[PDB]
């Protein structure tokens, strides 16, 4: 009071100094259930794949991709990423993801990287310099290899031109290096574009079949329909805690409601555009939002020249929510005044018919 009034002496009366308020706890966050993540049952765990030139381009745009199950998995050899942090994959969103699938030799996996070149990286599959994504490759020599050598895979080895980023062509024209025209068969300067590969179970590192997939991330003007998992923590009622539901955030104590919302209405409001009700996206229950208690702290004090004992009044704040008697009035909670039954003349007006005075071994009585 001495500091608010900018005076070392305080006259008799009631003065307002500060404003009480309650702080939140643990920051409860809520989100809907996480079911049907993505149809990954045909790419990362498929049985029969295609060649390097017949790579699939399955679109991943209408399912919540979970990159934590693949980053924390030990069944993969390489999990390098480019242009994006592998940890924040589940925190951000995307628009459309292309699911690639093609088998390549063990030593040819290094050439599959943005900014790299090579015989296969320039004639079968090329990545752009501004590629933003992750590369995933794991060993598959135990199921892709067969007795006698695997020759079911082919690849392009020679062509007149290279391949553009994200380009796929099934043209099998014969290559002509020299000026001699080719009629349709091989010869001096005529060669076949497709060549059968070889995969044997007895081969060492570098020649084993490694199933490498490419995950391209694109963010165009289309709405973000694919994201990652979220926290979805636990909730608690009858406590002041700042909440964050699906699409909004607020601060207040939640409690069991009794209203009956509509099956499509999630948020609640009232006059003057004040949020007062939200539904639990997991339990489908309605919770009434109540702002946490707050009130101007008034300090009832007599003249400084008379005594130094003071009383504290929390306007509109219940006594059970404040944390030398404690008496609850209609104006708020009064701490430091003894309640008496004798009715004297009002000296220091507190409110709601209660007044304070400095009477008789000597304190303030309400």
């Amino acid at each position: 009071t001495k500091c608010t009034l900018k005076s070392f002496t305080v006259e008799k009366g009631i003065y307002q100094t500060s404003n009480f308020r309650v702080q939140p706890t643990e920051s409860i966050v809520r989100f809907p259930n996480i079911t049907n993540l993505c149809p990954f049952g045909e790419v990362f765990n498929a049985t029969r794949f295609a060649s390097v030139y017949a790579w699939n381009r399955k679109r991943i745009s209408n399912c919540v991709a979970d990159y934590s199950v693949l980053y924390n998995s030990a069944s993969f050899s390489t999990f390098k990423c480019y242009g994006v942090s592998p940890t924040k994959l589940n925190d951000l969103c995307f628009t459309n993801v292309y699911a690639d699938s093609f088998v390549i030799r063990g030593d040819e996996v290094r050439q599959i990287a943005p900014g790299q070149t090579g015989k296969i990286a320039d004639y079968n599959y090329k990545l752009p310099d501004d590629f933003t994504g992750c590369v995933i490759a794991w060993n598959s020599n135990n199921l892709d290899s067969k007795v006698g050598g695997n020759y079911n895979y082919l690849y392009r080895l020679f062509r007149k031109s290279n391949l553009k980023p994200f380009e796929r062509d099934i043209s099998t024209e014969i290559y002509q290096a020299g000026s001699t025209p080719c009629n349709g068969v091989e010869g001096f300067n005529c060669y076949f574009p497709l060549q059968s590969y070889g995969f044997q179970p007895t081969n060492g590192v570098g020649y084993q079949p490694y199933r490498v997939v490419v995950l391209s991330f694109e963010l165009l003007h289309a709405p973000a329909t694919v994201c990652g998992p979220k926290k979805s923590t636990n909730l608690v009622k009858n406590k002041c805690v700042n909440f964050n539901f699906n699409g909004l955030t607020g601060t207040g104590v939640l409690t069991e409601s009794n209203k009956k919302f509509l099956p499509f209405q999630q948020f609640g409001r009232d006059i003057a555009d004040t949020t007062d009700a939200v539904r639990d996206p997991q339990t489908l229950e309605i919770l009434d939002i109540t702002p946490c208690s707050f009130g101007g702290v008034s300090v009832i004090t007599p003249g400084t020249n008379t005594s130094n004992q003071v009383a504290v009044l929390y306007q509109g704040v219940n006594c059970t929510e404040v944390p030398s008697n404690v008496f609850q009035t209609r104006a708020g909670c009064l701490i430091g005044a003894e309640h008496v039954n004798n009715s004297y003349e009002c000296d220091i007006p507190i409110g709601a018919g209660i007044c304070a005075s400095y009477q008789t071994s000597q304190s303030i009585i309400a």
Binding site: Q200, T202, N203, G204, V205, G206, Y207
Partner: protein, 126 residues
């Protein structure tokens, strides 16, 4: 420890390091077979013998020499001349024949004399 890389997973599961005997016919002749597609394996009926130890060292040196230029085309995965391919394998055996190496490995006991008679005998035998 010299600096050569490790072996492949197919070298220890395809090589015949044990003579089957009369159960099946198999020629016991040390040869460093190079299949050309990362499959390196030694064909030798190695037994408990110092000569067999040096022969196994020679075969492993040949395998290492073959794996040295493994990242080359088929017309280049071969020695420069007809004398280097065997000299690279024989130098490892000539270096491993020192008694200090066998003593450091654990074959020869630490208590061993260093007289010049054994050195002269070894030089004459070589």
């Amino acid at each position: 420890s010299v600096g050569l890389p490790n072996m492949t997973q197919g070298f220890w599961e395809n090589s015949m390091l044990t003579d089957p005997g009369n159960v099946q016919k198999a020629v016991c002749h040390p040869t460093a077979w190079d299949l050309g597609k990362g499959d390196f394996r030694i064909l030798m009926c190695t037994k408990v013998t110092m000569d067999d130890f040096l022969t196994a060292h020679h075969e492993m040196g040949h395998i290492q020499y073959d794996m040295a230029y493994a990242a080359q085309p088929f017309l280049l995965r071969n020695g420069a001349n007809e004398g280097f391919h065997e000299a690279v394998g024989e130098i490892m055996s000539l270096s491993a024949a020192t008694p200090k190496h066998l003593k450091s490995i654990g074959l020869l006991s630490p208590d061993f004399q260093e007289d010049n008679e054994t050195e002269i005998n070894f030089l004459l035998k070589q």
